C-alpha cells in the first residue's frame, strides 16, 4: 500500500518539478536575450543561469 501511494504521487511530483525546470529555463533564455541586446550586465545573467541548474 505504501508502494502504491508512492507510485500514485511521484509521477505528478516529477511533472511539477519538470514544469519548474522548464519555467526556469525560459527565464534563463529571456535573460540571455536581454544580456546580448546589451540591457543588463553579466551578473544578473549568471544568477539566472545559477538558478536554472
Amino acid at each position: 500500500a505504501d508502494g502504491l501511494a508512492a507510485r500514485g504521487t511521484f509521477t505528478e511530483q516529477l511533472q511539477a518539478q519538470r514544469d519548474l525546470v522548464k519555467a526556469s529555463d525560459e527565464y534563463y533564455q529571456l535573460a540571455d536575450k536581454r544580456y546580448r541586446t546589451g540591457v543588463d550586465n553579466y551578473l544578473t545573467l549568471l544568477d539566472a543561469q545559477r538558478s536554472l541548474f
Binding site: 546589451g38 540591457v39 543588463d40 550586465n41
Partner: protein, 52 residues
Amino acid sequence: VSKQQYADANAAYLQSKAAVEQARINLRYTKVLSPISGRIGRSAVTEGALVT
C-alpha cells in the same frame, strides 16, 4: 556593467562638460575682448561703473 549604463554615464559626462563650457564662456565674457583690431577711442566709463 551593461552597455546601456555605460551609455548613460557617457551621456551624463558629455552633458556636464557642455555645462562647464557654458560656464567657461561666461567667465570669458567677464574679461571683454576687442572683437576687431584697430584704433580705440577713449573709455566712456571708468572703474566703479556698474554695467549690465
